[PDB]
Design a protein around this ligand. Sequence first.
Ligand SMILES: *[C@@H]1O[C@H](CO[C@@H]2O[C@@H](C)[C@@H](O)[C@@H](O)[C@@H]2O)[C@@H](O[C@@H]2O[C@H](CO)[C@@H](O[C@@H]3O[C@H](CO)[C@@H](O)[C@H](O)[C@@H]3O)[C@H](O)[C@H]2NC(C)=O)[C@H](O)[C@H]1NC(C)=O
Ligand SMILES: *[C@@H]1O[C@H](CO)[C@@H](O[C@@H]2O[C@H](CO)[C@@H](O[C@@H]3O[C@H](CO)[C@@H](O)[C@H](O)[C@@H]3O)[C@H](O)[C@H]2NC(C)=O)[C@H](O)[C@H]1NC(C)=O
Ligand SMILES: *[C@@H]1O[C@H](CO)[C@@H](O[C@@H]2O[C@H](CO)[C@@H](O)[C@H](O)[C@H]2NC(C)=O)[C@H](O)[C@H]1NC(C)=O
Ligand SMILES: *[C@@H]1O[C@H](CO)[C@@H](O[C@@H]2O[C@H](CO)[C@@H](O)[C@H](O)[C@H]2NC(C)=O)[C@H](O)[C@H]1NC(C)=O
Ligand SMILES: *[C@@H]1O[C@H](CO)[C@@H](O)[C@H](O)[C@H]1NC(C)=O
Length: 192
Amino acid sequence: LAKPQNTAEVQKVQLTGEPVPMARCVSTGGRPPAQITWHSDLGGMPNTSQVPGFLSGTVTVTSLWILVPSSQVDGKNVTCKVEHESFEKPQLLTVNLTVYYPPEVSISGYDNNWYLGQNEATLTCDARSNPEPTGYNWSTTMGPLPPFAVAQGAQLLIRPVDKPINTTLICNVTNALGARQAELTVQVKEGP
Ligand SMILES: *[C@@H]1O[C@H](CO[C@@H]2O[C@@H](C)[C@@H](O)[C@@H](O)[C@@H]2O)[C@@H](O[C@@H]2O[C@H](CO)[C@@H](O[C@@H]3O[C@H](CO)[C@@H](O)[C@H](O)[C@@H]3O)[C@H](O)[C@H]2NC(C)=O)[C@H](O)[C@H]1NC(C)=O
Ligand SMILES: *[C@@H]1O[C@H](CO)[C@@H](O[C@@H]2O[C@H](CO)[C@@H](O[C@@H]3O[C@H](CO)[C@@H](O)[C@H](O)[C@@H]3O)[C@H](O)[C@H]2NC(C)=O)[C@H](O)[C@H]1NC(C)=O
Ligand SMILES: *[C@@H]1O[C@H](CO)[C@@H](O[C@@H]2O[C@H](CO)[C@@H](O)[C@H](O)[C@H]2NC(C)=O)[C@H](O)[C@H]1NC(C)=O
Ligand SMILES: *[C@@H]1O[C@H](CO)[C@@H](O[C@@H]2O[C@H](CO)[C@@H](O)[C@H](O)[C@H]2NC(C)=O)[C@H](O)[C@H]1NC(C)=O
Ligand SMILES: *[C@@H]1O[C@H](CO)[C@@H](O)[C@H](O)[C@H]1NC(C)=O
């Protein structure tokens, strides 16, 4: 028998409809051939294959992990387990998935309890994409931003109001692949 060594890269992927290979794992020069299995919180479909090795009697196994690409998987871990009767213990190889996609946006920092004459409250335009977003843009459903709302990069500062107002905000985010956007209505009364 022969002790074979192995590798594993990460096959970068876009947002195609079909299930494509997102991670490869390979054990070259096995005798006998090695056993390759995958383990992770988000299992899919592993497709294995093998070609003759270098020294007569050996075999190199090449297994790829196929899955239907999706935004929440970017950054997640996938582990390949190469087990063979010649190692001290089953060897473990881990890859760091990668998926490019348009920006998914949302706005936080608003508790329906906004009243007249309060202190400066600021909202953040939460956005998760790959690769990182290149530009942020604030505007209103009416066109230009009201005078009490001054834009600050990826955040919008809301100053004190003298009289009640209404305005649905829009955060247009642009990264290297596209440009998306969120919506959001905000109110300020008097009450107590
Ligand atoms: C901010 O807007 C509110 C109302 O907000 C409401 O929802 C928004 C998304 C828009 O669709 C608005 O058009 C809509 O009003 C203003 O106060 C609202 O005024 C309207 C009419 O002036 C009130 O209509 C009432 O409807 C109820 C039943 O739904 C009837 O019982 C009443 O008789 C009356 O017809 C509406 O009730 C009232 N909304 C609230 C929550 O009180 C508000 O004036 C505006 N801000 C400022 C500073 O003017
Ligand atoms: C897979 O690898 C990627 C990058 O190779 C990892 O992304 C990295 O995520 C960490 C934490 O989530 C980021 O580190 C933090 O950076 C900020 C700087 O903004 C710093 O303030 C923090 O103290 C911390 O160091 C890191 O920026 C980010 N890498 C890149 C290139 O953006 C990802 O976590 C890996 N995924 C898994 C499942 O291991
Ligand atoms: C694993 O993938 C291989 C190819 O990587 C599949 O082989 C294909 O087989 C289909 C029919 O089943 C053929 O139409 C293709 O030409 C083959 N593709 C290649 C690249 O050879 C194989 O079917 C897959 N294994 C399993 C068990 O599904
Ligand atoms: C995801 O994979 C990374 C490696 O890319 C893991 O990082 C290891 O963390 C352990 C314990 O924290 C360390 O002993 C190792 O040194 C780290 N690996 C490297 C190469 O530095 C991480 O544990 C994994 N996390 C998840 C959630 O899967
Ligand atoms: C968002 O910003 C991009 C970049 O300039 C622009 O082309 C696009 O028209 C904007 N989208 C909307 C809905 O305003």
